[PDB]
Amino acid sequence: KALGYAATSVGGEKIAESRTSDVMSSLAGKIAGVQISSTSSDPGASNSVIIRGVSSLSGTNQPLYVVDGVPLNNSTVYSTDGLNSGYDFGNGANAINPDDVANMTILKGAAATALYGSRAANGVVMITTKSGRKEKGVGIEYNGGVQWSTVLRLPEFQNEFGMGWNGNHTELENGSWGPRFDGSMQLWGNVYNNSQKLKPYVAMPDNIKDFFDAGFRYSNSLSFNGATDKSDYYVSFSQISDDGMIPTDADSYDKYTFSARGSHKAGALTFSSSLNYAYQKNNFATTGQGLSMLNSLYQTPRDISIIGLEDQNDPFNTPGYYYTPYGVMNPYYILNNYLNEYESERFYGKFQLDYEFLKYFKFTYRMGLDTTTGQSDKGKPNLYALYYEGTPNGEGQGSSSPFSGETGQYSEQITRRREINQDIMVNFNMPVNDFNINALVGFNGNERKVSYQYSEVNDLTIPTWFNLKNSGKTPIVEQHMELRRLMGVFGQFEGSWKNMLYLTVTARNDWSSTLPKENRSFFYPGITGSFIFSELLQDVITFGKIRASWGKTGNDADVYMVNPVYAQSSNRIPFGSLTFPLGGVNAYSAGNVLGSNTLSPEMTTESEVGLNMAFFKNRLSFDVSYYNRNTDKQIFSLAMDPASGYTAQNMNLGKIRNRGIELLISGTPIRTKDFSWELTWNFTKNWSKVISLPEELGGITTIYGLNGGTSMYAITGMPVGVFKAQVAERDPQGRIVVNSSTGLPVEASEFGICGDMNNKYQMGVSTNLKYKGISLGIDFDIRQGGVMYSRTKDINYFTGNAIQTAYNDRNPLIVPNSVNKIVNGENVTYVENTTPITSSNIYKYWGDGGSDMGSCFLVDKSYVKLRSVVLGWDLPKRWLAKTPFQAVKVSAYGNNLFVWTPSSNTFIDPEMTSFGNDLEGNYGEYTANPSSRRFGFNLMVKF
């Protein structure tokens, strides 16, 4: 391979063997320098693919997917408020049908990108779809599968105390800070009709594990295939329907695809065309801190039965009389009476005209279209009008009821995306002597557009009905559109010498819409070398290859980042907004992000060198790459002192750097005609470092964070993703300071840097057995390093449910290194502490994070996982023969089967987020639904 940077090719068979709805999730831990995480285990969700770390401080770091080989739309659809209404609906590449994948090839370097443009800076996932035959006999391949999912990891709970606060008993608590379990009959919950439920005060450990069912999902695939000496035709249809382990149909994903791809050669001239249609309907059991389903589930005392709260003829479960009023509702109700739906119709495809002429030349024209409509319909009942008066939840809770002012809301949004891409190329390929010159010169044109229409309606008249006319109060209406365009010209020169020295030289030049008129043009060259020794007695070294490449790759800004705009006047206030018009007056404000027509194109320089060797007839094999990736002058909306009149300014950041080692090992310790055993060990170690952010705006900028709480940044001397949290004060050396009177730790002056987001190293191992027609595959995914915010740990600490909180058998205690600080004027003196945290105040010692305080809730990102297990029995051809089958392969598999995590983490599967599949998702998990354990069957029938 003349390629002089790292890359990896995966066969369609390995992609679809894992039988995932999705093309990338099965490659989760199997490819070095390609970090593949799923945002959650909700059906239909996004998937994250970052290669050689985050280069783009905000907020685009997926690789350019490229199907045939047309750029594919990879946009993502998730909630702009992960704190209160969190939901994730899809990734662009979730549409591609894994049974139509023939070869994936993940380009990783940013040095030879002229063919695939600027978006390649983040890697390219070159996909190439199946085609023609001939083959015995008629062309049909049928795949139909069936899988279940099961909850994988719930937080480790405690079963020593029950419902209560301050340590005392309580009938209505949303938490477990009560007396020790007696077994003694006690009351709980509200009083209805002068009666009340009375039950043994005993723990129930399974009471959450029991809430969940087993998600089910059925899959059906069909393909039709054939060919001649001048043509080929593939026609395919995939179908999926998923109903996850959360109860009800609230966790739904339906996927349908239909694709027709065909080629024909007469000439000289070849013409082919791919056309595809993709449907999906999602329903997301929303997460958040409000009346959502999970946050309502964790806030459950350890003695309360959750599967008993479902029946709604037991008046104690109807919204009015549910056992707790503390910002929480019956989960079964939230899933049954709320709406969060997403539907999508997509059309994308390509046309390609290849015409060979004059012995050595080839003309190729390629146009791609990818256009989408999607429609969200979220809504929630008028909880107030239906349940406030009368119920103790209710009038009885005054200003503080869960139903105020939950007066009902319904919105609807229709989103339209369209991008057309044009490639016009003329290749050249002649051999002279032992040399071989191939050159390629082309033109690329690209236009991308997105727009959406939104209407929302509040305070619903008929409480249940979700319709843009069931309201007496003014509707809210929003409308947006974006348009970018890019033209470019590129040449790629391939040198060669007798199949031994390959040299490549690419150069591209783009003119982008998103950069200031006066500075639209940026040029980036690239040089690649490849040296096979090997070609220089021993049948011991199958293959050897040494690689080097130095290249650049520019980028442009996001849209509309040059001119200052005036917006319609609105002000953000905590948990609200005060938006114009009022009253009868409309008004505009000066936009809070200063624009800049002094910008210059972004530039990524890479230096990469690698080595590849194979031994003993491809029975021991290893590939190693080292990379040094810089990314300078990235356009970013850098933070700024608001007193300047603006809240941020668009300017050119400094270098974001990723260096690291990408290494793959693979050997076949056994081989016969009847049994093979392969091993594989891949290892990735990356070093991420923000090198500088413009000095004059201070040093740092926020990437995501709570107001006065744990927030992740991008600081000048540090990695991408340095957290800060409230750490506890400590004296001149020791020495937790606590309050003289409560006993509780004492916040320090500043927050404290508490880790970055990055795994220190990631690696994966894999084994593959074959015995006659039997296959067995196992894969493990190892990541260690880094850290993430976890509201899962946060709410199980606040609630007193998490195992860690039975710390001192919940007897009064003195923080074991505590010290009071004695300040008089400016005299500072430290004294052994003598004040305990009392029983009544144990709840607060944990509620705020223990002696760690806030920072307690940055969880050790690290995990080890049993990624997948795939057993496959290829029936032997003699078996069938009296049947119309050309092949049968029964298959049984499991995914995300088991997670291991380091002691301090007994809360989550770290592979979670409530903030999307890119950079900001690294901030953490905001009570995302639990991850799940998937397993099932799949039958293949070739005709």
Binding site: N166, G398, S400, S644, G645, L697, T742, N841
Partner: protein
């Protein structure tokens, strides 16, 4: 593939956006803060309300356990400075009309005056510059007051007679009302110079001159403007009654004073207790202690009178209640004019005005004859204590950010020398009406709150931001 398309099409062309389109924003943005979260915390510092037993949220405020990083006024520093004051600056380089510049400049002076009374330092002379100074020096308080009081003075002098061409959701283009606002701003600021003991000769005669001309505003200076729908409500009601659940309950000082004076306004904003039907404040910072001392089922929400949000959905944002304007005038009579009969008039004038606004017109007597009559005030310092304690009631549920400044200047209500736990023990040592230092107090030096933190977003971005100081550092005009 045309490329000249980077003009954002979700926003109007900039040449089409003029003053009358920008100007309504200032009023509203300024009111997003002074009436919103600023008011919210200031209501604790001046001890009107406390944190409800059965909910957390404002724990760190009531208990003075917050730090600079708690960003307790970051949302508001962003609004006053990146909306309000830029939109001010935009209006001022867009209109040549004096009477609009006067209206803009006053509202400009108001923001600064709010920033100052919170962080006693504030960007000013270097702020509102673009990329040309992203890191402005934080001018000093006295500098800033002197500057804005000299912006108002300079803008007034340029009036010529034309009216306003501008949407005025505050005074509906009534110039004469704006000059009242401005003269009452002068009255407010002059009085602080005096009691900070700075240039106090001039500002005493300047105030003597101000009240003599009585050229103030009528009515209240408000944004009457909010509907009870969405995105349109009173900032405080939006935040604390829709976004959150009910976190507020009444404080021990406000409920004592009102219940000791027989005041009928105790029923405006406060509710009787869900349990015995009596009015019950909570001791500052006392949420967790009361829960340890009494039972757990004995200090729930139902044992302390909650704050009533009923009245707040459309309740306006006040910049200068008339009741306060009378309560400043009476003070200037009783201590810089020696004119007990005018001070009595203004003092009665205030209480009269407040009793109107709360829907209790015609009950002004109940306190103007009993307990709080002006005759019972023997000492020409007792009189002050009657003016001052009633400006404090005047501002309950009207302009809390002010009430806290007026507590700091006049130092009335007096700080009670008894501790929270002492008062809870033997309630008879409590002179009703006095502020109680918080029970859980995170100020090393104890005492009451005296200033907000600097804004964390200025910390991170502006290297010239003064370094932090405890909550207990006083503000440049608080000198006792």
């Amino acid at each position: 593939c045309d490329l000249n398309i980077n003009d954002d099409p979700n926003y109007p062309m900039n040449d089409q956006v003029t003053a009358d389109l920008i100007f309504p924003s200032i009023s509203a943005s300024i009111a997003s803060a002074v009436g919103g979260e600023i008011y919210n915390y200031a209501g604790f510092f001046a001890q009107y309300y406390e944190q409800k037993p059965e909910s957390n949220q404002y724990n760190t405020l009531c208990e003075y356990t917050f730090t600079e990083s708690s960003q307790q006024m970051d949302y508001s520093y962003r609004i006053l400075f990146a909306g309000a004051l830029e939109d001010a600056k935009q209006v001022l380089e867009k209109t040549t009309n004096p009477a609009d510049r006067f209206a803009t400049t006053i509202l400009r002076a108001y923001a600064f005056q709010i920033m100052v009374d919170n962080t006693s330092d504030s960007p000013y002379s270097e702020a509102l510059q673009g990329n040309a100074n992203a890191t402005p020096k934080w001018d000093t308080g006295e500098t800033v007051y002197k500057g804005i009081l000299g912006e108002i003075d300079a803008a007034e002098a340029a009036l010529d007679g034309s009216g306003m061409d501008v949407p005025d959701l505050i005074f509906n283009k009534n110039i004469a009302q704006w000059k009242g606002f401005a003269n009452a701003l002068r009255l407010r600021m002059y009085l602080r110079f005096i009691d900070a003991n700075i240039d106090a000769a001039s500002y005493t005669e300047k105030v003597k001159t101000l009240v003599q001309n009585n050229e103030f505003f009528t009515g209240d200076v408000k944004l009457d403007c909010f509907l009870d729908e969405t995105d349109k409500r009173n900032p405080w009601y939006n935040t604390n009654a829709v976004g959150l659940t009910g976190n507020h309950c009444a404080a021990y000082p406000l409920v004592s004073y009102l219940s000791s004076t027989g005041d009928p306004r105790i029923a405006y904003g406060i509710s009787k207790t869900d349990a015995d039907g009596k009015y019950v404040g909570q001791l500052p910072g006392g949420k967790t202690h009361m829960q340890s001392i009494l039972g757990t089922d004995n200090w729930k929400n139902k044992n302390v009178s909650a704050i009533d949000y009923s009245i707040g959905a459309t309740k306006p944002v006040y910049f200068f209640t008339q009741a306060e304007l009378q309560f400043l005038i009476a003070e200037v009579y009783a201590r810089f004019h020696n004119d007990d009969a005018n001070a009595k008039s203004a003092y009665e004038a205030g209480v009269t005005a407040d009793f109107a606004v709360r829907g209790f017109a015609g009950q002004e007597n109940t306190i103007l004859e009993g307990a709080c009559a002006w005759s019972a005030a023997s000492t020409q310092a007792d009189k002050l204590n009657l003016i001052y304690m009633q400006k404090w009631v005047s501002l309950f549920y009207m302009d809390h950010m002010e009430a806290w400044s007026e507590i700091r200047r006049t130092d009335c209500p007096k700080l009670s020398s008894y501790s929270a736990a002492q008062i809870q023990a033997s309630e008879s040592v409590y002179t009703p009406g006095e502020l109680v230092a918080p029970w859980t107090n995170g100020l090393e030096a104890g005492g009451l709150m005296k200033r907000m933190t600097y804004p964390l977003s200025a910390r991170q971005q502006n290297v010239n931001t003064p370094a932090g100081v405890p909550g207990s550092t006083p503000v440049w005009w608080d000198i006792k």
